[PDB]
Design a protein around this ligand. Structure first.
Ligand SMILES: [Mg+2]
Ligand SMILES: [Zn+2]
Ligand SMILES: [Zn+2]
Lengths: 205, 359, 169, 105, 304, 124, 76, 228, 76, 75
């Protein structure tokens, strides 16, 4: 089911993000037990810039996904810890994404900490190795210098480019922030593969 | 609509046209419904545009009924001892005693102990033709056990030749053979008689019709043919031709109530086409459209009349291969000599090369 | 719920529940009203029981428009509320009703019982169709069609034109 | 069904709380026996067709538009029998005027 | 084209689904092509068939002959005043009680019972045991109590199960207290009848299809394989088939643009639009670049 | 122009008498209809009508060709043979412009044709 | 709607200097040739501005006028 | 040389010499073909569509095989041998079982080709060279129409309950009652066979009208979303 | 209430209005209806009906008044 | 087709529209289909069956040969 796939592929997501785990991996039984008891499983990883990315895995029937007060408490407590906190990732059931109160607390604490990136994603984002899916063309983030020279040669503003959501599964796995540029190598039945650059825009939900 | 005088065919088809006034509904109302044969020409319709199937033409024998004497038949039904009035039977009696609801023009009057018996008795009274008018509709619904009598205006009727069986004698002989077999006789099979079914129409009647001395009214009054409505057509097993009736002359498993004339399923415009059943039916529909837009003697009073966009063609010929339609509409067109051949590529894609001298 | 709408200049856009029309016509008892549709109350078989439960749920459904009279057995109250929605006034609204409700059965007060029996039969047939006992009526079959020309078409147009040009002034 | 004896109406259920108590518009109440506990039910595609076509099957030997087959009637010994194919299960039923019905279904 | 239920591809229904960007639920001909994990078992048609059977969604009401929402409670210490027809259940209701000492009827029970009769023909047809049904119902319905008969007996004795509602389910309706206990009890029947006993949700059917595929050999030749078996389902659930271990999760092909977009992203949805339009165009379709114009226009914003 | 089988056609060529093809007996067409107009639309009634009318003209009769009357095209072709023509209604034919005979015998005969009242002077 | 100012008057147009007729086959015309009847050829006109390089070519048109073909009927 | 033939000679002439050369070559080769038939002659006859008496018997025997195969399926229905597989009801299984049994074999071309002289038959040559017509057209004219199918199913009993037409009994089991036409066009259809062809023929006319209007509304919405 | 009715054959100012006269002159082939008995109304008549002047006429009789002897009528 | 079809024809009178008509909208530019990238035009009907009759190896008269006069007459 969703929990075992999420458990096996969240670490593939962390490795694909070029992140190193601060803690140690627990067996699957311990993970599911901790999800059932605490209501979430928190995985902390460190980026190349020594920033901290915390991954929260919320069970379907946990208290946090139902009552916004506990979500507020958890987020406010973790965000006040003495960590660099490059990003916060919250993995929940897809029906939770349609729950207005949880979204309200997410956006409220996002406004409370302008520096920290807080993102909430469904399970299916991390229930597979997204970059290894055949139907997904190879995405890669390009630096602002490469994007700047490409736009200068093309006489384009970033807003003229085709757009891509920051919540797109390949972009989530890449870790692309809004305002960044992602180059896609798409297969072509007319040219036998092609390259486009898409502008990353604000995340959905 | 404006009477378009393209030809006599256009006139009598414009007066024979029935008008109905991107969904499944649009598809379904334009189809050839299985209730059409004999009443609506299965070929005639528009071939282009949204008017496909929106225009319906009466078949050749199809007529439109006038309102019959509803009250006379209603009093005959009420006075019938086989019908029990509504004030005498309750709903509980209806379901318990197996009574069938009797309607006249959709108005429920009385109930009967046997729907089939009532329908057959009144169909016989209609065949004889004095007490029950031949244009009345007597429909028995075997699925809900109702007998409906219809005499309202607007019914489509067509005459159908009646087929008669010896099914009563066949049944009696079957019982006799069974009883002989049960008594122990070895030759009980000799008691069985062959089943016979036929129409009473004889070649003499055909000659008399052609001679003019026999009319349809005489055939109806003699019990040879009777008028059938789509309502009653749902109660009929019709042999599509005298060939099919003759093939099953002794088939007790296929007992027809009527025998059809195959040309009756087409209208005048469709019957103009010769060997239409040897052609794709869509082309016969194309003929129904095109036969009504051809020049000719569009109106025999043309010089007295002042007309707009009316074309009078000097020369008309009877077709060398004529059809039954030309007995009723003046033939317009010519028996051109045509060569089916390639001649220089000038007749490609539905073009024609014409003789300038012929023009 | 089973709501019966009569299309008329006075009666329009109103969907009277069926039992109300049955009670306005007499025989206020709901058991006999049910019998008018099921034809037998002491009968087995699943179609009859399904009909009875269907009619029960129809009776008990709260009509947002006919809330006060949903349970009333006072026939005069039903007729009065109908009149305001559309004893001498009690009769007139009932007298206009039978003329506009199944006129082919009759337009006089001696045809109310047969009108109710026929209406019960119609409801029964609709319920048989909803039970998949029978298919819907074929909209293209010619058993249920009529062809009208000249005589019928002009007379109805003459009838409409006669009052407005002769009688109306 | 429960019909109010005071006014011949239908009494609603109002399950309260361990027992059924039928309630009318009169305020009349008759409670209810052990057979009143069936709140709802459903039987799946079972027990139909023969009763659904009871009138039609009874009328079949007399309808002249029904297909007939060459087969002796075991009851009255007619070499022809009326053949009926009803339902999506395509149930063949052979009936005769005498009353033979061949109840397979 | 067919007009059968499950896939309404008649007329212009499918092009409108593509061009008007209808969501997954609005689709009437959704399909998935699932590849069996690992290529050696791929050629096994019997293996592919049993994976298909395990994938088809099995709803509880599929296994049920009849059900009756009764008004009766069970305590095992009282008379309980049971329904006269179903008072014979107490012969095996006591037998169940002595066989399951760990599942005594609780005190918070209600008097709303749902007696159902299982279809043993369907159970053996899909190879579903009674305990598999019982475990599925308890896992998904924590606010009910379930008793049942014994499944080992032969024909003539039916499999009977009664779900007894608990008072916990009724207390959740205070926010919508206009609905009485009857409406809640009937409501839980619909939820209970639609509980998933087996299969992937949304997979109405799963048929084994023979695929044409290419592969590179040890010699480097590109050969075309005609012995490859895969599962073609009615209905789309990419996430559901992704969680299945018997399905290659990286080669799931759905006919839906909406499900491809939510699961895979805009670039995969853009490729799905091309493939979906090309299916409609037939074998006399336009140049491929005209399909790129449609898909790139429809996906230029990051959304379909 | 149209035949009674619904095969419409636009007249685009007027050839003089000397330019029309003619048979060995001097029979020449009024209309030259492409054989490619037959196979797709399957207007076989027109073919059968021409076959029957070839024998009708030589016998000096007008025959009933109503739909659903019994038809035997083999017997109609045998009737053609009995009237002195070939089994098919095909004759040796000469090109009018050159005088050369076609290698194939050409099917030529009387087919009833109608002028549809759509006029080019009205349309243009 | 389809008859409105946008769809009928703006996105479409009624135009001058245009002819319509039934089409028919001509195997003696090249694939990029169209057979234009002479009556329409005199109705529809081609505007030729007179200069030194075309004055001699345009004179036969001008002299023919409406009487003879190839003619001309207008001068600005 | 055909129109729309990718990789044909005119496509090649366009690729190497230009589309104007291809247009000039289409006209020039057209004149050669037309000037050849100016001497060769080409015609179609009623005898071109006529089967020999031996081939007509061969076609009759083929159809009798299809009717017997349909008849045996009926006998399996009379005795209840029709066992529908999972996913289909008995009616659905029977209907698809009858459609398969009433399909014409490939060998129906054998009597047609026996009667046809390919080097001289104008009807065959028009079909065989791709000029006009198809093999099903030739079989329908010469051998038999076969089974009428509307929306990949036989004629539904819409006349009444269990009746397709007034000419057939209720719950008729003969294949002819449901759109099987044993006759060919040359043989002439009977009245009920002609009616079924009309339903199929009118169905195509309706589809042509509805498709053009339905595609037109989609075409304009496609234009406005893409024109920029 | 009205109880006196008689539709009369079409009249021209009174002379019998023949269908040809109505067609050429542009009138309406209508007949008066009576409703003491009075009449202010006219009602179009169907050619060929018993209320038409051509009901009883034979082929030659139809020819003398200018009507088509062969057409059935049935129009207004 | 030629079963009654009508087509509009307008002759460009302006110099700009005439230059455009000749260089851009000439039907030589539509010989290859934009939709399918294949050729649109070719032989139809008589020329399709006449090309087969011309190029077939054998006729019923023997070999498919013509003398010099008829070979010249084809051109
Ligand atoms: Mg055309
Ligand atoms: Zn009461
Ligand atoms: Zn018997």
């Amino acid at each position: 089911m969703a929990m075992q796939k999420l458990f096996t592929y969240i670490y593939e997501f962390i490795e694909y993000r070029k992140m190193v785990l601060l803690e140690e991996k627990v067996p699957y039984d311990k993970f599911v037990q901790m999800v059932l008891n605490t209501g979430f499983f928190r995985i902390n990883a460190e980026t190349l810039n020594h920033g901290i990315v915390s991954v929260f895995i919320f069970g379907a029937n946990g208290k946090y996904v139902h009552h916004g007060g506990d979500m507020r408490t958890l987020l406010t407590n973790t965000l006040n810890e003495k960590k660099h906190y490059e990003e916060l990732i919250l993995i929940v059931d897809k029906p939770v994404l349609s729950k207005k109160n949880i979204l309200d607390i997410i956006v409220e604490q996002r406004a409370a900490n302008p520096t920290i990136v807080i993102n909430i994603y469904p399970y299916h984002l991390f229930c597979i190795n997204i970059p290894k899916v055949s139907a997904i063309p190879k995405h890669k983030l390009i630096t602002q210098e490469e994007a700047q020279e490409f736009l200068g040669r093309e006489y384009l503003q970033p807003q003229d480019l085709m757009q891509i959501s920051a919540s797109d599964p390949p972009v989530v796995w890449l870790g692309g922030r809004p305002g960044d540029f992602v180059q896609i190598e798409r297969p072509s039945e007319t040219a036998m593969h092609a390259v486009v650059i898409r502008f990353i825009t604000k995340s959905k939900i | 609509q404006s009477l378009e005088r393209k030809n006599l065919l256009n006139t009598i088809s414009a007066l024979r046209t029935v008008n109905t006034h991107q969904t499944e509904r649009a598809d379904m109302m334009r189809r050839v419904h299985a209730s059409y044969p004999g009443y609506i020409c299965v070929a005639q319709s528009a071939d282009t545009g949204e008017k496909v199937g929106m225009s319906k033409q009466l078949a050749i024998t199809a007529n439109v009924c006038t309102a019959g004497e509803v009250l006379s038949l209603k009093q005959r039904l009420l006075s019938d001892p086989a019908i029990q009035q509504l004030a005498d039977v309750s709903n509980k009696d209806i379901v318990r005693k197996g009574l069938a609801r009797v309607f006249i023009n959709g108005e429920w009057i009385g109930c009967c102990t046997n729907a089939f018996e009532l329908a057959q008795r009144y169909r016989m009274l209609r065949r004889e033709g004095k007490v029950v008018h031949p244009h009345t509709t007597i429909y028995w619904d075997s699925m809900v056990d109702e007998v409906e009598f219809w005499l309202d205006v607007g019914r489509l009727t067509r005459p159908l030749l009646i087929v008669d069986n010896n099914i009563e004698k066949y049944n009696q002989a079957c019982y006799k053979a069974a009883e002989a077999r049960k008594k122990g006789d070895k030759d009980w099979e000799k008691h069985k008689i062959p089943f016979i079914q036929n129409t009473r129409f004889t070649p003499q009647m055909a000659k008399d019709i052609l001679a003019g001395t026999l009319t349809l009214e005489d055939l109806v009054a003699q019990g040879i043919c009777e008028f059938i409505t789509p309502e009653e057509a749902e109660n009929c097993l019709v042999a599509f031709s005298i060939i099919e009736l003759r093939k099953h002359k002794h088939d007790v498993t296929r007992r027809f109530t009527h025998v059809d004339v195959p040309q009756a399923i087409l209208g005048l415009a469709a019957l103009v086409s010769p060997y239409a059943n040897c052609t794709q039916p869509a082309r016969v529909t194309y003929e129904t459209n095109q036969g009504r837009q051809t020049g000719g003697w569009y109106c025999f009073s043309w010089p007295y009349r002042v007309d707009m966009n009316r074309f009078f063609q000097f020369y008309n010929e009877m077709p060398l291969v004529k059809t039954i339609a030309h007995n009723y509409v003046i033939p317009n067109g010519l028996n051109t000599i045509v060569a089916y051949m390639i001649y220089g590529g000038y007749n490609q894609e539905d073009s024609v090369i014409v003789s300038q001298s012929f023009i | 719920a089973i709501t019966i709408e009569i299309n008329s200049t006075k009666f329009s856009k109103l969907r009277i529940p069926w039992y109300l029309i049955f009670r306005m016509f007499g025989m206020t008892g709901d058991d006999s009203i049910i019998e008018q549709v099921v034809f037998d109350l002491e009968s087995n078989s699943l179609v009859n029981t399904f009909m009875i439960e269907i009619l029960e749920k129809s009776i008990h459904v709260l009509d947002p428009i006919f809330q006060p009279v949903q349970h009333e057995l006072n026939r005069e109250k039903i007729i009065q509320f109908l009149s305001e929605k559309v004893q001498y006034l009690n009769e007139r609204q009932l007298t206009i009703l039978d003329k506009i409700l199944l006129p082919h059965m009759g337009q006089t007060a001696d045809t109310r019982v047969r009108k109710l029996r026929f209406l019960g039969l119609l409801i029964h047939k609709i319920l048989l169709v909803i039970m998949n006992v029978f298919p819907p009526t074929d909209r293209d079959s010619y058993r249920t069609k009529r062809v009208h020309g000249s005589g019928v078409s002009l007379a109805k147009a003459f009838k409409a034109i006669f009052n407005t040009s002769v009688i109306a002034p | 069904m429960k019909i109010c004896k005071a006014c011949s109406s239908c009494m609603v259920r109002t399950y309260v709380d361990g027992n059924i108590i039928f309630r009318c518009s009169c305020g009349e109440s008759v409670q209810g026996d052990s057979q009143n506990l069936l709140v709802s039910s459903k039987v799946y595609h079972t027990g139909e067709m023969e009763d659904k076509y009871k009138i039609f099957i009874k009328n079949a030997p007399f309808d002249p538009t029904n297909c007939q087959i060459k087969k002796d009637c075991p009851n009255c010994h007619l070499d022809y029998l009326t053949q009926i194919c009803i339902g999506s299960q395509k149930i063949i039923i052979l009936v005769c005027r005498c009353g033979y019905m061949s109840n397979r279904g | 084209r067919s007009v059968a239920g499950g896939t309404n591809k008649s007329g212009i229904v499918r092009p409108q689904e593509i061009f008007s960007a209808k969501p997954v639920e609005a689709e009437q001909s959704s399909e998935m092509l699932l590849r069996l994990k690992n290529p050696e078992v791929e050629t096994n048609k019997t293996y592919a068939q049993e994976i298909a059977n395990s994938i088809e969604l099995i709803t509880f009401e599929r296994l049920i002959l009849q059900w009756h929402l009764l008004y009766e409670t069970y305590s095992s210490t009282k008379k309980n005043v049971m329904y006269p027809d179903f008072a014979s259940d107490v012969e095996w209701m006591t037998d169940f009680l002595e066989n399951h000492p760990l599942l005594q009827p609780p005190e918070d029970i209600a008097n709303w019972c749902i007696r159902l009769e299982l279809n043993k023909t369907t159970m053996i047809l899909k190879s579903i045991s009674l305990e598999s049904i019982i475990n599925s119902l308890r896992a998904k319905h924590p606010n009910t109590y379930i008793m049942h008969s014994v499944e080992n007996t032969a024909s003539g004795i039916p499999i009977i199960i009664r779900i007894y509602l608990r008072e916990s389910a009724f207390r959740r309706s205070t926010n919508t207290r206009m609905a009485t206990d009857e409406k809640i009890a009937v409501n839980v029947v619909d939820k209970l009848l639609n509980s998933t006993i087996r299969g992937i949700p949304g997979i109405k059917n799963a048929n084994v299809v023979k695929l044409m595929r290419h592969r590179v050999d040890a010699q480097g030749k590109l050969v075309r394989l005609d012995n490859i078996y895969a599962i073609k389902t009615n209905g789309t659930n990419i996430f559901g088939a992704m969680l299945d271990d018997n399905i290659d999760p990286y080669t799931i092909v759905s006919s839906s643009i909406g499900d491809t977009m939510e699961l895979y992203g805009i670039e995969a949805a853009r490729q799905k639009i091309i493939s979906e339009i090309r299916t409609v165009m037939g074998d006399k379709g336009p140049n491929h670049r005209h399909l790129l114009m449609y898909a790139d226009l429809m996906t230029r914003t990051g959304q379909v | 122009m149209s035949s009674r089988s619904g095969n419409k056609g636009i007249a685009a060529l007027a050839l003089p008498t000397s330019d029309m093809p003619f048979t060995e007996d001097g029979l020449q067409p009024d209309l030259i209809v492409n054989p490619h107009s037959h196979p797709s639309r399957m207007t076989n009634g027109q073919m059968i009508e021409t076959t029957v009318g070839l024998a009708n003209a030589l016998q000096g009769v007008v025959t009933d060709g109503t739909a659903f009357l019994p038809i035997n095209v083999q017997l109609l072709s045998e009737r053609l043979a009995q009237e002195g023509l070939r089994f098919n209604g095909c004759q040796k034919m000469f090109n009018g412009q050159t005088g050369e005979y076609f290698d194939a015998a050409i099917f030529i005969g009387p087919t009833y044709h109608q002028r549809l009242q759509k006029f080019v002077l009205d349309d243009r | 709607r389809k008859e409105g100012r946008i769809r009928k008057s703006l996105l479409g147009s009624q135009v001058w200097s245009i002819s319509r007729s039934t089409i028919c086959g001509n195997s003696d015309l090249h694939l990029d040739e169209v057979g234009y009847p002479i009556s329409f050829a005199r109705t529809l006109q081609v505007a030729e501005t007179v200069q030194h390089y075309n004055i001699n070519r345009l004179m036969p048109y001008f002299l023919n006028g409406k009487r003879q073909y190839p003619g001309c009927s207008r001068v600005y | 040389v055909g129109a729309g033939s990718s990789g044909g000679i005119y496509h090649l002439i366009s690729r190497r010499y230009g589309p104007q050369q291809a247009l000039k070559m289409i006209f020039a080769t057209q004149q050669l073909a037309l000037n050849y038939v100016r001497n060769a002659g080409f015609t179609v006859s009623t005898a071109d569509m006529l089967l020999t008496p031996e081939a007509h018997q061969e076609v009759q025997e083929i159809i009798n095989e299809l009717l017997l195969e349909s008849e045996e399926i009926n006998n399996r229905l009379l005795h209840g041998d029709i066992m529908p597989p999972i996913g289909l009801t008995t009616h659905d299984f029977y209907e698809k079982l009858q459609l398969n049994a009433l399909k014409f074999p490939d060998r129906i071309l054998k009597p047609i080709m026996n009667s046809i002289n390919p080097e001289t038959n104008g009807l065959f040559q028009m079909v065989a060279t791709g000029a006009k017509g198809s093999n099903p057209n030739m079989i329908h004219i010469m051998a038999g129409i076969g089974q009428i199918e509307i929306n990949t199913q036989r004629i539904q009993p819409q006349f009444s309950f269990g009746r397709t037409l007034v000419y057939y009994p209720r719950f008729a089991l003969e294949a002819q009652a449901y759109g099987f036409i044993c006759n060919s066009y040359i043989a002439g259809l009977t009245s009920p066979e002609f009616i079924f062809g009309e339903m199929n023929g009118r169905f195509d006319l309706i589809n042509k009208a509805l498709s053009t209007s339905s595609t037109g509304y989609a075409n304009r919405k496609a234009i406005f979303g893409l024109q920029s | 209430n009205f109880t006196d009715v008689n539709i009369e054959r079409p009249q021209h100012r009174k002379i019998n209005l023949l269908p040809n006269k109505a067609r050429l002159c542009g009138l309406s082939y209508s007949g008066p209806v009576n409703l003491p008995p009075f009449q202010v109304s006219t009602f179009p008549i169907m050619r060929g009906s018993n209320r038409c002047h051509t009901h009883h006429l034979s082929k030659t009789a139809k020819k003398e008044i200018g009507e088509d002897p062969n057409e059935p009528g049935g129009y207004f | 087709d030629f079963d009654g079809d009508q087509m509009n024809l307008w002759v460009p009178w302006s110099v700009m529209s005439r230059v455009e008509a000749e260089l851009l909208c000439s039907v030589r530019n539509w010989f290859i289909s934009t939709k399918s990238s294949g050729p649109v035009n070719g032989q139809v009907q008589d020329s399709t069956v006449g090309s087969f009759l011309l190029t077939r190896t054998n006729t019923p008269m023997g070999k498919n040969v013509m003398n010099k006069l008829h070979a010249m007459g084809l051109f």
